[model samples]
Target chain A: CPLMVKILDAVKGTPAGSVALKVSQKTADGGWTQIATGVTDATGEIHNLITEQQFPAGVYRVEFDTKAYWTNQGSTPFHEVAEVVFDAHPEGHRHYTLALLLSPFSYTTTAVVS
Target chain B: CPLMVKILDAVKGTPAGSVALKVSQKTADGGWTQIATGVTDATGEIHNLITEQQFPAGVYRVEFDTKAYWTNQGSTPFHEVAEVVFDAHPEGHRHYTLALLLSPFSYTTTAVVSSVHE
Candidate 1:
């Protein structure tokens, strides 16, 4: 796997499980082409999301359906969705992890590139 | 002031300086009314951003110009800007500190709320 995600619910202080997300790559024509979709497990992560070959050097957008997650938790959320867009540089086998801390009205998204 | 901000550069691992931001309150008609604008200092903070009276119970938006910050550092960023919107509850004199961790292609924002007086 070349990409990973870790999400935590700040309000509950627990891993955000069952959160649905979609990955899309930026096309040459400035449009997005959907690549993959997944849901976080109990650990708030989806392993083996995509292989190194699938994640080429390009811009990608990870869209999280945060509103649905909060609604299922019985809370009213502000944003309709949470989107993280980044340009991936996979030269030399670099790995990326997107860490997100979520609240009903706020969220913190960080990236660990190694 | 009831709201605060602290920003850090993840790539440089230091406090992000000179980043400009704006504070806006959501209006009744779904429009936004700009309240204040500020630039972070060396410590990534702006003292006395808004009085307690200025921040009433309502929805507020804090937008950061991260693209400009990355461009100044000679990097190409992905997002045009970073925006955080939240419904504020100041019933018990709660204070909020928006902490942000930034990289060229990514960023993280978290809110620290303190109900006790500082």
Candidate 2:
């Protein structure tokens, strides 16, 4: 039980962009178990998450595609999906830093710990 | 030009809590003009600000005291303060909503609109 999560996207007014995220962990009556996935660069940032092992505590979910990064720029987003559910406590080495400050409509998420 | 801003805090992993925050706009040579101040409720939410008049386009800051909130619980926080700075554009009715979800050590902010740029 050791985990580290980092995801960031702080581009205001749009322009610099990147997207693609999917990480799940919530089983036992509920669904969702797709461990990890990544893609977020060009400044939007996505530190790491290609899991195959570690990660066991309780509920987790981070799906931020934002309508394929606003349809690759054509534009049309009034909050087309930006999910971030947390509560991960595996015990030690816990470092979950999630940061998102988007604006096609509005978005915000916290829990930072460099 | 008109403006409206709301702030809220959500608590978990700790008991219910609240704290005070100060809001101000930046002025010439970089000084802060005391604009408004309010304390969060047991539910951690401050809906309005007592002020003089409509704010113009420029920079603004909101300071939240984390230390005082933690001290009352007989504990110390790793980070003592949480601040959010943003650029405000004035020319129309703009609504700004900022929410803070804090633990002993981190926070985040965003711009939500109800009548933003109205």
Candidate 3:
């Protein structure tokens, strides 16, 4: 199984920024268990994180380090961070890619496979 | 100036879901003013939300209706919603396209421009 996503800092006129992603697995009692952590590249994208050994179908979430990215650039942001909550169910060798469009004031996310 | 983004639902075993996006502009006092609201298309992509009226460069947030989409599909989602926070500064005739790759469990976003001048 392959799990990954691309994050973009959409603010213009500002220096480039970096993004960090935290992934988790859903627990039986409705809690998210930490799975992996990765940082975005110069292009603000990440690829290939999950391996074999299929897991059950459930919910999950990813937290983007928006605050640190902006603060590092000397801007005071209203929200320090942003989050994306989604669901995942793997049958066989599945590939899941999530992408985020971000700015200092706003952002959006979705799942993609290619 | 144009503001837009594409959203994709990437769940393997589940039916497709629709996404609703709410855009806002930041106020002088740091409050966000609701600018527009639209639902994602069949492919979960949205284009052309902002017009030529340039807005001051600042922070913005978009909230997606994850709970409603999943609940409509007969699934209990841990989170009823999800959000993305970002910043935007416009030069002259700038084109900003934001795209999201989403699943029941996670997602990501980015900005792209066809051309850049040095």
The lDDT leader among the candidates is: 1
**lDDT, residue B62, model 3:** 75
lDDT of 1 by residue, B1-118 (tens): 6999999875554688999999999999999999999999999888898999999999999999998998998867767898999999977878899998776556678999984557
Where is model 3 more than 4 Å wrong at Cα? Answer: A1-114, B12-17, B114-118
Query: Tens-digit lDDT track for model 3 on A45-71?
Result: 665555645345667777878778767
DockQ of each: 0.03, 0.05, 0.03
lDDT (tens digit, per residue) of candidate 2 on A13-107: 22234687778888998998878777776766665564324566778888888766766765556677888888776555566666766534445
Q: How far out, in Å, is residue A75 in model 1?
A: 42
- On the 0 to 100 scale, the lDDT of residue A87 in model 1 is 99
Better of 1 and 2 by lDDT: 1
* lDDT of the candidates, in the order given: 0.88, 0.62, 0.65
Q: Which candidate is the best by DockQ?
A: 2
Task: Using lDDT as the measure, name the better of candidate 2 and candidate 3.
Answer: 3
| Model 2 chain B lDDT-worst window of ten | B7-16
Q: Compared to the true structure, candidate 1 yields what TM-score? A: 0.52
Docking quality of model 3: it rates as incorrect
TM-score of each: 0.52, 0.47, 0.45
Ranked by DockQ from best down, the candidates are: 2, 1, 3
